[PDB]
């Protein structure tokens, strides 16, 4: 695990973190590889690594969603490592966060999850919280299960389940 | 244990 200081994202895709090319080379990471991230409070996340030409060697660019998921702020430190084992998921189960789906919400798959996931090959982990903007509503979801467990890539054959009671915040 | 319910195949 290489340690890196958390910096702001330029690429706003939730699945993406960015490193300098020299840091990618040092870690033997290739553009598009899955990486495992460790943050505070024993939190983990899986992301896709890309290079960024303005990124300092000792830093990682990550968006607010990934920061929140790792319980880190700008300027905090995370660890990174390659996560090459991650397979295509058979199925995943995600549930919305109650306070983002109070009152009437359209079908979560159609409005949020399908556009979010479609052709993105997003790595996800059990326990992640992610945010989808469905114009102009933002719904947050929690990953309650993956198969395989506890992480997978959400691919064309992956079956996405989102039925159940909304999750309570905190 | 866990209730998966029913789901949608993402597709491409």
Fold and architecture overview:
Chain B: It is found in: Endoplasmic reticulum membrane. Chain B: It comes from Homo sapiens. Chain B: Belongs to the derlin family. The complex is a heterodimer of chains A (170) and B (12). Chain A is 14% helix and 39% strand. Chain A is mainly beta and 170 residues long. Chain A has two domains: 1-85, Barwin-like endoglucanases (Beta Barrel); 86-170, Vcp-like ATPase, Chain A, domain 2 (Roll). Chain A has a six-stranded mixed beta barrel. A four-stranded mixed β-sheet of chain A has the order 9-10-7-12. Chain A has a two-stranded antiparallel ribbon with strand order 8-11. In chain A, a hairpin with a 5-residue loop joins strand 3 and strand 4. Chain A starts with a strand and ends in a 9-residue tail after the last strand. Chain B is mostly beta strands and 12 residues long. Chain B is built from no helices and one strand. Chain B has one strand at 7-9. The chains are: A mainly beta (170), B mainly beta (12). The interface between A and B is medium-sized, with 20 and 11 residues. Strand 12 of chain A pairs antiparallel with strand 1 (7-9) of chain B.
